Design an enzyme around this catalytic site. Structure first.
Site, PDB file in Angstrom:
ATOM      1  N   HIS A  68      33.899 -11.636  30.896  1.00 13.08           N
ATOM      2  CA  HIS A  68      32.544 -11.328  31.431  1.00 13.08           C
ATOM      3  C   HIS A  68      31.698 -12.602  31.528  1.00 13.08           C
ATOM      4  O   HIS A  68      30.640 -12.698  30.902  1.00 13.08           O
ATOM      5  CB  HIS A  68      31.892 -10.253  30.585  1.00 13.08           C
ATOM      6  N   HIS A  72      33.411 -14.316  36.722  1.00  6.83           N
ATOM      7  CA  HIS A  72      33.383 -12.872  37.065  1.00  6.83           C
ATOM      8  C   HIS A  72      32.167 -12.604  37.962  1.00  6.83           C
ATOM      9  O   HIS A  72      32.300 -11.882  38.954  1.00  6.83           O
ATOM     10  CB  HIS A  72      33.411 -12.016  35.796  1.00  6.83           C
ATOM     11  N   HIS A 106      24.883  -9.243  37.585  1.00  7.79           N
ATOM     12  CA  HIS A 106      25.176  -7.862  37.107  1.00  7.79           C
ATOM     13  C   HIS A 106      25.659  -7.857  35.655  1.00  7.79           C
ATOM     14  O   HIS A 106      25.620  -6.768  35.029  1.00  7.79           O
ATOM     15  CB  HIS A 106      26.176  -7.153  38.019  1.00  7.79           C
ATOM     16  N   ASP A 107      26.101  -8.992  35.122  1.00  9.60           N
ATOM     17  CA  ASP A 107      26.663  -9.084  33.740  1.00  9.60           C
ATOM     18  C   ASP A 107      25.983 -10.226  32.963  1.00  9.60           C
ATOM     19  O   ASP A 107      26.511 -10.644  31.920  1.00  9.60           O
ATOM     20  CB  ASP A 107      28.184  -9.249  33.776  1.00  9.60           C
ATOM     21  N   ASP A 217      32.949  -4.798  41.154  1.00 10.40           N
ATOM     22  CA  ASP A 217      33.048  -5.069  39.711  1.00 10.40           C
ATOM     23  C   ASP A 217      34.495  -4.930  39.277  1.00 10.40           C
ATOM     24  O   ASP A 217      34.902  -5.715  38.436  1.00 10.40           O
ATOM     25  CB  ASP A 217      32.189  -4.104  38.918  1.00 10.40           C
ATOM     26  N   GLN A 269      47.372   0.109  31.934  1.00 11.95           N
ATOM     27  CA  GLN A 269      47.034  -0.287  33.330  1.00 11.95           C
ATOM     28  C   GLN A 269      47.264   0.910  34.266  1.00 11.95           C
ATOM     29  O   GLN A 269      46.344   1.177  35.095  1.00 11.95           O
ATOM     30  CB  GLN A 269      47.787  -1.550  33.774  1.00 11.95           C
TER      31      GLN A 269
HETATM   32  C1  LIG Z   1      41.893   1.834  30.724  1.00 12.53           C
HETATM   33  N1  LIG Z   1      42.869   1.200  29.901  1.00 12.53           N
HETATM   34  C2  LIG Z   1      43.545   1.694  28.789  1.00 12.53           C
HETATM   35  C3  LIG Z   1      44.404   0.634  28.361  1.00 12.53           C
HETATM   36  C4  LIG Z   1      45.273   0.610  27.230  1.00 12.53           C
HETATM   37  C5  LIG Z   1      45.979  -0.552  26.898  1.00 12.53           C
HETATM   38  C6  LIG Z   1      46.831  -0.572  25.793  1.00 12.53           C
HETATM   39  C7  LIG Z   1      46.963   0.559  25.021  1.00 12.53           C
HETATM   40  C8  LIG Z   1      46.247   1.702  25.353  1.00 12.53           C
HETATM   41  C9  LIG Z   1      45.390   1.750  26.448  1.00 12.53           C
HETATM   42  N2  LIG Z   1      44.289  -0.484  29.165  1.00 12.53           N
HETATM   43  C10 LIG Z   1      43.357  -0.132  30.080  1.00 12.53           C
HETATM   44  C11 LIG Z   1      42.931  -1.069  31.133  1.00 12.53           C
HETATM   45  O1  LIG Z   1      41.527  -1.172  31.353  1.00 12.53           O
HETATM   46  C12 LIG Z   1      41.213  -2.041  32.335  1.00 12.53           C
HETATM   47  N3  LIG Z   1      42.192  -2.732  32.949  1.00 12.53           N
HETATM   48  C13 LIG Z   1      41.762  -3.559  33.916  1.00 12.53           C
HETATM   49  C14 LIG Z   1      40.393  -3.692  34.263  1.00 12.53           C
HETATM   50  C15 LIG Z   1      39.941  -4.584  35.317  1.00 12.53           C
HETATM   51  C16 LIG Z   1      38.923  -4.032  36.252  1.00 12.53           C
HETATM   52  C17 LIG Z   1      38.547  -5.092  35.294  1.00 12.53           C
HETATM   53  N4  LIG Z   1      39.430  -2.984  33.646  1.00 12.53           N
HETATM   54  C18 LIG Z   1      39.830  -2.162  32.671  1.00 12.53           C
HETATM   55  C19 LIG Z   1      38.747  -1.345  32.036  1.00 12.53           C
HETATM   56  O2  LIG Z   1      38.952  -0.355  31.281  1.00 12.53           O
HETATM   57  N5  LIG Z   1      37.492  -1.691  32.468  1.00 12.53           N
HETATM   58  C20 LIG Z   1      36.393  -0.921  31.956  1.00 12.53           C
HETATM   59  C21 LIG Z   1      36.347  -0.922  30.408  1.00 12.53           C
HETATM   60  C22 LIG Z   1      35.447  -2.122  30.205  1.00 12.53           C
HETATM   61  O3  LIG Z   1      34.692  -2.491  31.350  1.00 12.53           O
HETATM   62  C23 LIG Z   1      35.006  -1.467  32.267  1.00 12.53           C
HETATM   63 MG   LIG Z   2      28.935  -5.024  33.163  1.00 11.88          MG
HETATM   64 ZN   LIG Z   3      31.159  -6.846  35.583  1.00 10.21          ZN
END
Ligand SMILES: Cn1cc(-c2ccccc2)nc1COc1ncc(C2CC2)nc1C(=O)N[C@H]1CCOC1
Ligand SMILES: [Mg+2]
Ligand SMILES: [Zn+2]
Length: 313
Positions: A68, A72, A106-107, A217, A269
């Site tokens: 962040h 970004h 935004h961040d 975002d 993912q």
């Molecule tokens: C959902 N989840 C869940 C596990 C996960 C991994 C390991 C074990 C269990 C669960 N790994 C994930 C991957 O989450 C993301 N992956 C990629 C991106 C990219 C867009 C920026 N964003 C997020 C995300 O959650 N972005 C949200 C939360 C914070 O800011 C906004």
């Molecule tokens: Mg934000």
């Molecule tokens: Zn952001």
């Protein structure tokens, strides 16, 4: 006035594409952002002296956190640029002015922790702002920087135009609260399918801009695989730091934030692409057809995470 920003040929061409990476040379990001404003908005939108001073105060107020950060901010503004350029006639002079600035801001002053961690930590910001904690803070920081002497990039706007733009920027920044995304997309889904969506309805525009803000975002998932993969490391570096802090408060974090559960990242993912990213870019393409490349690139990276699970990388 006759001073255009130009980029090298490869950047000049690649910057128009949705999947453009702004590269590792921090000192070029300001020039990239000004270039985008000048082509998106006009050479006249901002007094260059004030814009440059605003950009460098914004940069200063981003922190050295793994994801962040300033990079970004500029990446998210570039995605918004791509959308505005591919949807020329759909947006007002004021929307093009507000949304690029909204994206850069935004961040602002993000510490690399979720709203949830602020609340469980009982951070002062969680008492001042009960929901969208960081997002109201980011807006508050934007208004602070706009009021520094020499920094008011909107000085040439009327009283009411100035208020319209700070209102576009505020809704745009609040919308980056991913908890507000789900409801906002369902409403846009229902509105598009029943044929009730109407871009002359201001409350409808607000929702659409909100979706764009989610789209820009999350745009890390719309890059070429090697960029998406390497960004994943920065994302999890914050998540795991937050998990560590949760454990220090005596709280088992969710698995997403538990570095003991790295193994489960590929599956995590998948969930995120299916539950959030794909729906986001799907609905955005329905409303704004020329943003299809973001959906295509997102689907390409889903397929690449499927390959990681199958042991093919
Ligand atoms: C959902 N989840 C869940 C596990 C996960 C991994 C390991 C074990 C269990 C669960 N790994 C994930 C991957 O989450 C993301 N992956 C990629 C991106 C990219 C867009 C920026 N964003 C997020 C995300 O959650 N972005 C949200 C939360 C914070 O800011 C906004
Ligand atoms: Mg934000
Ligand atoms: Zn952001």
């Amino acid at each position: 006035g006759l001073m255009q920003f130009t980029l090298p040929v490869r950047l000049c061409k690649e910057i128009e594409l949705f999947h453009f990476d702004i590269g590792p040379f921090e000192n070029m990001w300001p020039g990239i952002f000004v270039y985008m404003v000048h082509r998106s908005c006009g050479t006249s939108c901002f007094e260059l002296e004030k814009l440059c001073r605003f950009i460098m105060s914004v940069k200063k107020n981003y922190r050295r956190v793994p994801y962040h950060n300033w990079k970004h901010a500029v990446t998210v503004a570039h995605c918004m640029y791509a959308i505005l350029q591919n949807n020329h006639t759909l947006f007002t002079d004021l929307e093009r002015k507000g949304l690029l600035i909204a994206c850069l801001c935004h961040d602002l002053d993000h510490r690399g922790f979720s709203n949830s961690y602020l609340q469980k930590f009982d951070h002062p910001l969680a008492a001042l702002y009960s929901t969208s904690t960081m997002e109201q803070h980011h807006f508050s920081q934007t208004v602070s920087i706009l009021q520094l002497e020499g920094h008011n990039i909107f000085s040439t706007l009327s009283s009411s135009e100035y208020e319209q733009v700070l209102e576009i920027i505020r809704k745009a920044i609040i919308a980056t609260d991913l908890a507000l995304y789900f409801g906002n997309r369902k409403q846009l889904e229902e509105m598009y399918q029943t044929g009730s969506l109407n871009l002359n309805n201001q409350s409808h525009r607000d929702r659409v801009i909100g979706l764009m803000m989610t789209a820009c975002d999350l745009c890390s998932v719309t890059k070429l695989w090697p960029v998406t993969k390497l960004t994943a490391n920065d994302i999890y570096a914050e998540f795991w730091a937050e998990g560590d802090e949760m454990k220090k408060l005596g709280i088992q974090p969710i698995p997403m934030m538990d570095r003991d559960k790295k193994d489960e990242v590929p599956q995590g993912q998948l969930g995120f692409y299916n539950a959030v990213a794909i729906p986001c870019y799907t609905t955005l393409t329905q409303i704004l057809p020329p943003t299809e490349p973001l959906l295509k690139a997102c689907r390409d990276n889903l397929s690449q995470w499927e390959k990681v699970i199958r042991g093919e990388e």
